[PDB]
Amino acid sequence: GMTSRRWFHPNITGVEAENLLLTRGVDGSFLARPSKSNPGDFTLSVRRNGAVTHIKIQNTGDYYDLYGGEKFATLAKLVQYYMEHHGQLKGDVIELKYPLNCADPTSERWFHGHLSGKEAEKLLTEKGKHGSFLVREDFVLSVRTKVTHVMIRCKYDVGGGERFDSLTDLVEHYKKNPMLQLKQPLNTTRINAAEIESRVRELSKLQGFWEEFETLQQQECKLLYSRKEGQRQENKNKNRYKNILPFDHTRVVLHDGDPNEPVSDYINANIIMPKSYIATQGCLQNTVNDFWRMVFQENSRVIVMTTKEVERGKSKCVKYWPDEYALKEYGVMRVRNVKESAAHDYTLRELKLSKVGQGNTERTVWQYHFRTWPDHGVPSDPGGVLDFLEEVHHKQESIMDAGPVVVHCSAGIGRTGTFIVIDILIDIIREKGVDCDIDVPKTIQMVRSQRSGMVQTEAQYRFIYMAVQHYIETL
Template sequence: MLMQPVRHNCALFDGHPPVSPASQCLINLVHHNKYNVGSGEQFDDLVGLIEHFRLYPMIENSGDVLRLLQPVSGTRLRAHDIDQKVQEMREMEDFQKLDYNTGFDGEFQSLKMLDDRHIFTTNEGMKAENTTKNRYRNILPYDQTRVVLGRRDNKCESDYINASYVRTTRLSDSCSSVQSSNESLNSVKSLILKSDLKKVTPLVTKSLSDDALREVKKSLKLDKINGNICPDPVKEKMYIAAQGCLSNTKDDFWRMIWQEDIRVIAMITNEVENGKKKCERYWPMSGHEERYDNLIVRSISETHYEEYLVREIDVHNDKHCCRTIYQYQYTAWPDHGTPPDPDGLLAFIDDINRRMSEIAQEKNAPEQNVLCVHCSAGVGRTGTFIVLDMLIDKVKSSGFSCDIDVHSTVKLVRAQRSGMVQNKAQYRFIYFALQNYIENRNIKMKKQMHVSLAYYLINKKVIRQLLAKASPFLNIS
């Protein structure tokens, strides 16, 4: 039964330049709210349909391959195209062309429809003995992804805490440079091999793609001269998304921190906001210590920055084993909405990742790099932070030509904890923060590239001068 036909414009390509710029493809919304294009495959949403046909092209009766190049409602994009994506979204809002099914709002609303299809249970959180451990009655961890607290010998303890594992999967990408960038890169490499220094500098200062600049930097081995532009993403990172502590869950929280060998905590809330308690203080004042069940927690230091602060905390168990925990608290998130400027949160994320990288190099490093993230409910700001961090890691590891997908990443984390990224404002903020990060890193890379290349050219010139002076004394055949 055909309920509602939807027309969707897409670009089709048969392996040669297209005869016409676009063709019309009729997408059918059929019974049970499934989408298809008449080929038999059924999809729960338009995003899934579009991504499928980007990977697996349509075949016409004539045998021609029709490839979906860039569907207008696709959510996946190249990292270096994020400016264009954000601009289009903003223009749709500015000119009031945005309806409920397009733009930021359309992408976000489609996530809410997908949430209704989740079949995970929340039985543990709904048990009578655990209800007092939930800050909000409607925000519970899935049984399938919740953190289960281990029981100690001869102790009858609850294994429940309102916290969820959030794992990341490596999203597929195609990080190839465009042809013009490859040609520019090859030209630079050939000139370097020929030592034609006069031609290298002006060519490199032209607008090469970011991938080309990175490859030239690699070819010149400039990492060893000036160090890495940006540290590699933390390897094998996993998140635990948790609610803010209640007065009766502080012991459980530290039990979890010790059990999961967590060394870094990201707290994205103040203790009190707008007169409401958001999170109980679960750490002692600087220079003091407190006992939480069998753990002794001592605050060593507290360092304040413009929008966040860092606490160094030592934790001892009853077997005299000690670990150092770093708690990062972001204090500049407003009571309502999102930060007006993403720079502070990006600095916060960068500092956390730097710390995790350092810890991973230590002798007693944990087997798994687990980052505990919490706000008050453990879904809104927490989800925004985790999604943004995942996407930044993707760009760090794969470059500006990699595919990124805010929608799919939010869908990924929501499949592990319900309600992650709570509202459209947070969803939009991810785009704006990611745009800011890519723009700033792009500028930094290009500046560093030019400085490194100049350093290389100066050194090469000096070596040539020394060789010229020494040549009369050298026996060169």
């Protein structure tokens, strides 16, 4: 009974609130709405013994109060507390029993929110077809056959005829008896952080997640950038798969290599910029020296390993780090394993990297080896991955001038993309909280333009949503 603001009515008045509660509601019903008493503050309208009371909710920027009593980080938390505790007093007691859900479009797939008539016509032509429709903010029920914008007055009707209780009912009733014929919706992928729980329910019902991923897969044609360095005879033995190559414009360029070697400037790795990252593949025996040259050169102090060296009988990454207490040389680079510490889902190895011939070059590189990801599929609970990502974030924040975080699996696209995309999104939520707009496929596309095919499966696609929703819940 958390996260969602369904009982929140953003555009109603005190008189409308009383009317809704007295007609549509019952004793113990309630809704929240913005305060007319103070901008930014909220007012809670509740039905008690046949009449409606209005309670002031203080919003200080740091917390939410009822001008005294317990404090909460979000409005939904304040509401859940009072719904489950019943310590809402004046000295009269008020009970928060049944939320009165807002009938206006909110977290709806077909609802594009704030979007101009020209912007909707630009969207219904570039990505839309015949019968295709979108609802924008009164409400414009824009259709396409050329785009015809059917207006709607708020009871809700499209000029005349039938008055439906909610727009979710009026969008399904105008598709059966066409006024213009409605066939399929344009659909949005943007979702407000606080409403992810609702959207995840929509995408789970018969399929939303499949639709979203397939659509995203269809847009890879627009990301057919040059991979010329990756596709060369001199670099053919440096790639795990001949089809998974770095883009030339984003690739990590290596310097001062072995002159005997034909090409020394190459590694299957790309810089990812939303704090930057290096999405790289698992080490091949022949690329171990290159990986460390790159770690040194880029000033990275954190490595995120998301694969076991051996998974389902196959070599996914070669062991590129020395054993506990030991030291090893990897070409020009020396690595010393100082300490290995273990947690439930991962192991942290504290490594000391330096150029051979100079101790004045030594820096600590922290390797966060995630060991519990399944051979095939995604983890049941996103908690572990989130606790891991929080550990990696604090380490990166705690270090001065630390370079990009090197993230890798085998190919450097599947789990690498999943980890980087989850980290990018939860960072938007860290800086803006529950009141921010997040677009999972817009973010994936943005990362895909930097390294090809980041986030390989639909399982992974759903897992990003599952981790981001779970992150929101804990706030």
